[PDB]
Amino acid sequence: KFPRVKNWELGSITYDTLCAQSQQDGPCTPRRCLGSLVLPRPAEQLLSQARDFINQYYSSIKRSGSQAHEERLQEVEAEVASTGTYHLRESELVFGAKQAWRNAPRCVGRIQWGKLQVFDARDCSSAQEMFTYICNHIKYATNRGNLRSAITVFPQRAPGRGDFRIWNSQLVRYAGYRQQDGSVRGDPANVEITELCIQHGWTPGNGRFDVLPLLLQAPDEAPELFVLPPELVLEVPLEHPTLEWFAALGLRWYALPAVSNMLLEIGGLEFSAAPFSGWYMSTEIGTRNLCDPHRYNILEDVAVCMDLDTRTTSSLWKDKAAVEINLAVLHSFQLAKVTIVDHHAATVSFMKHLDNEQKARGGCPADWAWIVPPISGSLTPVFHQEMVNYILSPAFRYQPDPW
Amino acid sequence: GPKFPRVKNWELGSITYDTLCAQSQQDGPCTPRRCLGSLVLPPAEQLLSQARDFINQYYSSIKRSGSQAHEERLQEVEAEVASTGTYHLRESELVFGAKQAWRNAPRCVGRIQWGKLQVFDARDCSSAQEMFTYICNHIKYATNRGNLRSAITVFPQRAPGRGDFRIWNSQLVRYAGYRQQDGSVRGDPANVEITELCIQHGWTPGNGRFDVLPLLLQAPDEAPELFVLPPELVLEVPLEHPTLEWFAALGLRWYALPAVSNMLLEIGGLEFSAAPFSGWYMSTEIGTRNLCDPHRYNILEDVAVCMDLDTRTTSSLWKDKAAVEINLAVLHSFQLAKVTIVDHHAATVSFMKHLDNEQKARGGCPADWAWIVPPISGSLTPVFHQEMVNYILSPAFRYQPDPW
Ligand code: HEM
Ligand code: HEM
Ligand SMILES: CNCc1cc(OCc2ccc3ccc(N)nc3c2)ccc1Cl
Ligand SMILES: CNCc1cc(OCc2ccc3ccc(N)nc3c2)ccc1Cl
Ligand SMILES: C[C@H](O)[C@H](O)[C@H]1CNc2nc(N)[nH]c(=O)c2N1
Ligand SMILES: C[C@H](O)[C@H](O)[C@H]1CNc2nc(N)[nH]c(=O)c2N1
Ligand SMILES: [Zn+2]
Fold this sequence. Notes:
CATH superfamily of the largest domain in chain A: Nitric Oxide Synthase, Chain A, domain 1
Number of helices of chain A: 10
Number of strands of chain A: 18
Helix content of chain A: 25-40%
Order of helices and strands of chain A: EEHHHEHEEEEHEEEEEEEEEHHHEHHE
Oligomer: homodimer
CATH topology of the largest domain in chain A: Nitric Oxide Synthase, Chain A, domain 1
Shape of chain A: globular
Number of domains of chain A: 3
CATH class of the largest domain in chain A: Alpha Beta
CATH architecture of the largest domain in chain A: Alpha-Beta Complex
Radius of gyration of chain A: 23 Å
Distance between the termini of chain A: 42 Å
Bound molecules: protoporphyrin IX containing FE, the ligand CNCc1cc(OCc2ccc3ccc(N)nc3c2)ccc1Cl, 5,6,7,8-tetrahydrobiopterin, zinc ion
Strand content of chain A: 5-15%
């Protein structure tokens, strides 16, 4: 019933009891673990999810059973009974957004969960308005390199009406230009979105790091195209501390990781456009974004600059180049005074988070395969920590691409 | 479409479906409410069903499913359980079973090799001395002076009302772990308990960082007896670095042969409590886990200081740098000594090929992602980007409680 969770570096044993609060099914069954899969394969429903959330909210401020609690439950019940739905008070929304981050099993950065600026953009009626909110989000979150976590929340979904959607997966993304000679200039993860932009009338560039426009969509309307003011988008040229040739690669990355394709669910209400940003862990850029084969794929180029043996795997040329690239990202962001965390500091902070959550709730939902970094796994403490994975609401969820 | 798990490779974009998982009879630790996949250790009627199942598997493998000999073997096994409460496997059944157990092992990245496994039948063994002889032969055969060969030696099965054959050590080769009076550990901390068990049983202990442990061997209903391995049987590789000349002076070494000996081999409900097996190392096992784990030899800081790295800050990536050079030293020295080894890139590539083989051969392959992905350079290898389905097929290797 209650899972025995062991740390194999220290011998420590905990027991997760938070998992009992899980109301949603994951992809595993006793016959097969599907834990490594990236994506997933009436009115009393909503009402019970609403009651549960309001109950959480009032417990958070230590006022359970009180008359403000009991009254808020009836407001929620009266509205659902008459309209099939209801609305969150802003304070509740602020709470809900923090819990969704706190509950995100794949996020290594949750030590920060209580510090989150929440912009209420539920009074949005057009793509143009959505653009203003996004520009402001970016300005606030970027704060000249002293990054600050933020989320902007657009109107929730409503029955028989199209969704508010940001078509881009992140607020800032580099273009992917498919050359007709088989290759791709720019970021191959972004080929499809780049093509959507062009079809919607964007005039494309031809660099490896062309910042994409935002395609914003208000309900049942064609998406509209907005170019982000170049001064809003802070970027960091990459250079290496000892390899003077590194900067000559023209490599660079943007400061702000702002995810915009996820759906935020609070108390049974769904928010299809709710972009959020924190700051980068260095490996995201250094390992995944630049070294992944289906991305910028720079491993070989850097290895040759380093004059390593490329002819054989046993010279570990890949491992060596990757370390230097990650070092270039850390150095450069620190040089440009932009908030960034290395994977050792991050994982160490995540262990402290686990301990805080253990005392606070009796567990912490965590997805080992995502929490463990993409290089130097067992060299971080999270590797040796067993983790229980489950779904708590409020939550961030994936949703289909709107096209 | 298909009512089976869909499996994606995110590098290549390719999709497969796992139908093999339908063959699983034993439940794992996960439920719809929570995934426990990262957890390291989570009657004649029952026997007969497992026995019938394995006999069906065996006859399938030789393409005689539904045949007269198949049905006679079924009747033969049932009648044997009917009078003894257990049954016995034929030689070729044991060979097929042992190989299928390796094939079925979700955590093993080396399964491309699964059909080339030398199976030594040792079901005649009747003493601890004789266990020693068999073990020595295994080591000689498998070590083959550096040109390593996969092998398993299978000792008599669990019998009703008779003690188990057990090998107390977790591997046939392991370094002593000597607990110091100043709290620390000399040698391998992983092996503190078995070292103390060896001493309690009469072994005169050394005081090195790399003292090879004696074997504690247990024949049925008898106390374990102690056997020292003749040193020439135990191939070691001194560690040096291709370009960093000082690395040799660290005096580090590792043994050639990884030979796991505490696992239980299960076949058709028959349980072989002693069935040590061995292949060859993947370099990250030695270079990353055994030598760099904090709770193992923990040499990361030593090496980083020799490399003159800034160890006062995480963001210098000193751990990452030292780790790479240690791994490189493992590879270089094993190659120089001409002792079979595989780096984590070559291994993971070979595992992708294996997944493709098994997709065609069996409609899928049970695989534990957290264990298949290597402990350094994870996403630099192709398996990181490969979704995997994990489940228990039988025949299997299983963990078993320690004899004491
Ligand atoms: C403040 C610093 C933060 C750091 C260092 C951090 C770190 C990370 C990293 C490394 C990942 C893995 C992402 C990947 O490989 O694609 C991740 C995932 C995630 N993060 Fe954070 N994060 C931070 C802030 C936030 C904030 C403010 C939110 C939302 C309020 C958030 C929500 C999430 C979610 C929902 C995931 C999982 C995405 C998925 O399931 O695909 N994070 N985080
Ligand atoms: C031939 C070369 C082989 C290589 C390179 C190889 C590689 C590996 C590696 C790296 C692991 C991870 C273990 C750990 O980190 O603790 C592993 C696990 C495992 N291997 Fe293989 N292996 C090989 C041969 C074999 C053979 C011959 C057998 C048995 C007949 C076998 C059975 C297993 C089993 C049962 C595990 C899982 C152990 C556990 O679950 O705790 N392997 N292998
Ligand atoms: C799961 N496939 C990639 C994917 C990642 C997503 O999130 C990545 C993500 C999410 C939140 C983050 C927060 C901070 C940070 N530095 N990186 C972060 C990275 C969202 C949608 C998709 Cl489709
Ligand atoms: C659970 N981790 C410790 C443990 C590891 C075990 O096996 C590790 C193992 C098993 C087989 C291997 C075969 C080849 C190889 N290179 N390494 C191999 C490593 C068995 C039991 C235990 Cl208790
Ligand atoms: C197949 C595998 O589950 C997939 O590639 C995962 C593994 N772990 C990850 N971990 C993080 N942080 N981000 C990712 O995109 C992934 N991808
Ligand atoms: C807690 C976690 O499951 C544990 O550290 C695992 C992770 N993956 C592993 N992978 C391999 N190959 N060997 C191991 O011992 C482990 N340990
Ligand atoms: Zn699972």
